Write an enzyme that holds these catalytic residues in place. Structure first.
Site, mmCIF file in Angstrom:
data_model
loop_
_atom_site.group_PDB
_atom_site.id
_atom_site.type_symbol
_atom_site.label_atom_id
_atom_site.label_comp_id
_atom_site.label_asym_id
_atom_site.label_seq_id
_atom_site.Cartn_x
_atom_site.Cartn_y
_atom_site.Cartn_z
ATOM 1 N N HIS A 68 0.813 -1.231 0.000
ATOM 2 C CA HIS A 68 0.000 0.000 0.000
ATOM 3 C C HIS A 68 0.844 1.277 0.000
ATOM 4 C CE1 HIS A 68 -1.926 -3.328 2.240
ATOM 5 N NE2 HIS A 68 -2.944 -3.111 1.424
HETATM 6 S S1 FES Z 1 1.994 -0.437 3.098
HETATM 7 FE FE1 FES Z 1 0.383 -1.830 3.687
HETATM 8 S S2 FES Z 1 1.463 -3.636 4.342
HETATM 9 FE FE2 FES Z 1 3.068 -2.165 3.913
#
Ligand code: FES
Length: 141
Positions: A106
């Site tokens: 993410h």
């Molecule tokens: S940014 Fe969501 S698990 Fe690393």
């Protein structure tokens, strides 16, 4: 008897060794002079998470570069390779926008001391119980 003992005698500057401990990766990076200087150039006020997240020192310690490494010289960065958002493995070799690690799940970016700088992750990558027991060996746990 959980502790393990990692030979770091062959780890050169700019190399990360990844070892499995308690079922998860531990990153052991021998930092470059650029990594060290850049880590020490960040002001606490710039950080998303000002806590060192370091098992070896006071739980209220500030996330200064010096409180993120095992050694005073700042060459040895040992941390859990577990993104603090949802636990994916961050990608290293000076990745992301802050010269450290990038978690592609993410889009979290960690700096050269493993501190969270951008993205959904709330915390700096935590540092395990870890210490050198001689010139060449780090005990984890
Ligand atoms: S940014 Fe969501 S698990 Fe690393």
């Amino acid at each position: 008897l959980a502790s393990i003992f990692v030979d770091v005698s062959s780890v050169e500057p700019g190399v990360q060794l990844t070892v499995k401990f308690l079922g998860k990766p531990i990153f052991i990076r021998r930092r470059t002079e650029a990594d060290i200087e850049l880590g020490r150039s960040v002001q606490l006020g710039q950080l998303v998470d000002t806590n060192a997240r370091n098992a070896n020192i006071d739980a209220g310690a500030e996330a200064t570069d010096q409180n993120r490494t095992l050694d005073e010289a700042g060459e040895w960065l040992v941390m859990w390779g577990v993104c603090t958002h949802l636990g994916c493995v961050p990608i290293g070799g000076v990745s992301g926008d802050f010269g450290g690690w990038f978690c592609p799940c993410h889009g979290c970016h960690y700096d050269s001391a493993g501190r969270i700088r951008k993205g959904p992750a709330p915390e700096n990558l935590p540092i395990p119980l870890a210490k050198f027991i001689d010139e060449t060996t780090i005990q984890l746990g």
